[PDB]
């Protein structure tokens, strides 16, 4: 209980701090639940300590505009210190300060609307592909796992606009290239690895010295080299790969080699699971609302008549399709909290952030929180409708976070989703299964993932 | 040999390093002869490991100057890192950044020419009190030991300059605010402990969190509630205490009352020990050429006729003094080293340096080469007559180092110490004795003091 005296000291409510543990026995039904408690129990501002790191959690629109937005450069830059991480200290999402403005810098127009619209034709060839693979087991008459057919569709977009490799993944389980981005799975904070870091963060100075490092070694040293033939077998004769290597020919230095693989690997991590995940709650809530996928099934018809292949400005031209995916990104936001670490002793909207405070916004909570959402935890696409989404604050509904610090790939996985979302029900439908969890129930982990996998019933048109 | 290959690439010459181990094993014959050779064999600019950290060496005056004082706030603004310190990251010589220009506005006016002008016949008063302990020494006829003689005048020095304690230290030893300070010792950074956290500096956040400090935690409890009674014991009722408690009665924030105790355990670590080990360089140069000492007694004679008492306008009128000092501390740089640490990859002088290297300047190395000092090794104190003090470089001669992160009490340790030395030579005067150490030879641990006690013979006049 070194630091364990802050909270009581400048009048800030919250839960009793055990020695050393501090607030991590919570976790115990998830970081879900324990931010809903908390905003019940201490109202808009109230804090806790992950071990002995203190965490202030606010809930208030003006103040987080201030820490995501105003004072970003300032104060709130960086994110939650984690490791061992190694090499990849030098990826965007890790770096912190110059290094990462620098980073940012060196990769924004590879997301500009100029380059997604060229990855379009790219992406929409797996949309086929995925169609193909799911008519199979249509005429089968069983019920699909999604994550597992939603997986190697996201496994052959990122292979294709990150590197340029065309693999039908489900179709080529053994594939070299394959075989190793499916090493790569999401960080469990709550497993008791992360949880001994957190509560022992003096031991990952020896990890780091070990060369132990939470990215399998094994999958870096395959990538780290599989860029650097890449780089000397496309050289000399639109991928994520290619727009780096331009960007090299040109703040204010090039990108380094090792940097290349860094946000490559970064990358991976982002588009593979999230995108698989998301899909799989949309058509969770498409199977159990009917009326909401039949709608939307009409919706694509009309642009995409003889079901027309989606186009950049079809996509964007959806509404109804925008205001699916938007709902289901609000009753299961990946990032559950958004954080930053402060960085000065400073003062935002009359009250005193002292240094070294990480600053968290539970996303999950304000997404369910009836002060904001009429009936928050039913499936209601309207509210996104262009005649309601002004009663919307844009720092309480955040999938993407916000400010400098955002999603960076926030329009491509729109995008990247919204095409299997069309050519999907361009062809079938999804009826609810005997063992399809109805309703889903949330993992107690650190990741936003169902307890159970979702099966459902799928059918021809 | 993680970073091992670093002066490899920009092609800085260095000893070759061994694994985990760096360079340490040159410091077999301490700080001073290997900076001497590695200033030999590699010229103006040289690079080494403590371990993993890179040491980049540096001797041009031009370049010492931009580290020094130019690029000072912008890149060499704090020194190397080492722990555990605990509380006491929060003094000024270990505060980094802005904690460490809010510390040193702080205490900026303390060390003013005015507060010291106060302090003469305060720090005047235990020069008669050295002067009786001498005398019944010198009446014994037996050699007697300086740093011991010196060190319980400096003892009663900082005992009434920082807290206004007024004690005959050498009379009473067994004092309870002389016995605590007795307890406080120059830190010897070739010992077993501090080599091991220089290898294993990843063993730092373990004592860190085991409560484990440097400074043992006795003497640290003494002193933090000594001064929270004189902080209420004196008030309501010229000291550096008291100079401090008016601070916090006005950057931009008060000094807190657990900085106070910071602040005051760094003034008795620098004024003690080094003020009774320059004194006793000072003696046994004196000692070994007389020809010098006997031109100091008869200028001190002049200016303070009858054995006057000197003050702080007499005092700056000598030279002679001045130059005997000055060529002491050429000749015995108790500092040895200046490092600043590089907290950007900035390019001086044209050449590149990287982020986290620690930038050094051997101070002993260019105090005794022969490209700027003839004969170097001799004590020839009309070196600083101002004669010759013009051929003299302000970045080779740096006993108290430069630049805005320069000594702050300067002023405050040459007054002390010539005040000393006056009422000592207006009373005796020293000869070789048969155990003295002809010549000297210095410590091969990291401390800047003879191996042998310096014995001396002690005369009435
Ligand atoms: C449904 C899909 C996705 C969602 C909901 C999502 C959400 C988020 C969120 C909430 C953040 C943190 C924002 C903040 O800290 O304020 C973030 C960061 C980030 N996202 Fe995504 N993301 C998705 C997919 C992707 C994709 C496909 C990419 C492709 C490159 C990507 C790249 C990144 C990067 C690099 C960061 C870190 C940015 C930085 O630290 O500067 N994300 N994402
Ligand atoms: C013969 C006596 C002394 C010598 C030769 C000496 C020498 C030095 C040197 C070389 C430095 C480092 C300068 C640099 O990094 O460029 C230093 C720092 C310092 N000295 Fe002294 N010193 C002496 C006595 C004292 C005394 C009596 C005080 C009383 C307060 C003192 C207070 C300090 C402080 C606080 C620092 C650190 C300043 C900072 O980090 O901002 N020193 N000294
Ligand atoms: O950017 C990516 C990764 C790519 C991505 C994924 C999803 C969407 N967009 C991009 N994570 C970003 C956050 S850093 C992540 C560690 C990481 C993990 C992988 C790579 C780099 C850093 C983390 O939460 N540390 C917290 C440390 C901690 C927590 C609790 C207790 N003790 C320690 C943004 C993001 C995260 C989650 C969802 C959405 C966005
Ligand atoms: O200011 C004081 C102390 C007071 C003082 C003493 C003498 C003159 N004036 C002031 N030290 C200052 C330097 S920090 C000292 C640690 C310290 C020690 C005590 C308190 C705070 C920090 C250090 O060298 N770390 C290096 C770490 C290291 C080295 C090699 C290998 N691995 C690790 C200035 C100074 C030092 C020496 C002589 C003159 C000035």
Redesign the interface.
């Known amino acids: 209980t070194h630091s364990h005296g802050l909270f009581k000291k400048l009048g800030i409510p919250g839960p009793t701090p055990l020695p050393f543990l501090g607030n991590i026995l919570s976790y115990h039904k998830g970081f879900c639940m324990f931010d809903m408690e908390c905003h019940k129990k201490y109202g808009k501002v109230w804090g806790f300590y992950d071990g002995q790191q203190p965490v202030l959690a606010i809930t208030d629109p003006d103040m987080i505009k201030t820490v995501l937005v105003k004072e970003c450069y300032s104060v709130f830059t960086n994110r939650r210190p984690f490791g061992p991480v190694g090499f990849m200290k030098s990826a965007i999402s890790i770096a912190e300060d110059?290094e990462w403005k620098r980073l940012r810098s060196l990769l924004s127009p590879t997301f500009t609307s100029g380059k997604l619209k060229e990855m379009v034709p790219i992406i929409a060839q797996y949309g086929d592909v995925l169609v193909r693979n799911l008519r199979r087991e249509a005429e089968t008459g069983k019920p699909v796992t999604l994550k597992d057919v939603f997986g190697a569709y996201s496994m052959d977009v990122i292979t294709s606009t990150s590197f340029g490799v065309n693999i039908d993944s489900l179709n080529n389980p053994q594939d070299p290239f394959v075989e190793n981005t499916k090493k790569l799975l999401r960080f469990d904070f709550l497993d008791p690895f992360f949880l001994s870091i957190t509560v022992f963060?003096?031991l990952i100075?020896?990890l780091?010295?070990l060369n132990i490092c939470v990215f399998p070694r094994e999958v870096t040293n395959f990538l780290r080299k599989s860029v650097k033939r890449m780089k000397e077998s496309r050289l000399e004769d639109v991928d994520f790969l290619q727009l780096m290597i331009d960007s090299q020919n040109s703040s204010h230095k090039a990108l380094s080699d090792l940097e290349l693989v860094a946000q490559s690997i970064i990358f991976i991590f982002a588009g593979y699971e999230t995108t698989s995940s998301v899909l799989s709650f949309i058509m969770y809530e498409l199977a159990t609302h009917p009326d909401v996928q039949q709608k939307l099934q009409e919706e694509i018809d009309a642009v995409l008549p003889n079901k027309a292949p989606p186009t950049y400005d079809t996509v964007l031209q959806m509404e109804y399709l925008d205001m699916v995916v938007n709902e289901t990104l609000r009753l299961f936001p990946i990032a559950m909290r958004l954080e930053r670490v402060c960085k000065?002793d400073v003062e935002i909207n009359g009250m005193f952030i002292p240094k070294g405070v990480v600053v968290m916004i539970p996303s999950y909570a304000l997404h369910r929180d009836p002060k904001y959402w009429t009936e928050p935890e039913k499936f209601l696409p309207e509210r996104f409708s262009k005649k309601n989404k002004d009663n919307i604050d844009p720092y309480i509904y955040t999938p993407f976070g916000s400010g400098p610090r955002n999603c960076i790939g926030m329009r491509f996985a729109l995008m990247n989703m919204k095409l299997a979302l069309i050519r999907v029900l361009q062809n079938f439908s999804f009826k609810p299964c005997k063992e399809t969890q109805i309703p889903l129930k949330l993992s107690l982990g650190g990741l936003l993932q169902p307890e159970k996998p979702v099966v459902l019933k799928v059918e021809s048109r």
Do not use: D, Y
Request: proline fraction near 25%; avoid cysteine; charge should be negative.
């Open positions: 110059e963060p003096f100075p020896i780091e010295v000065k």
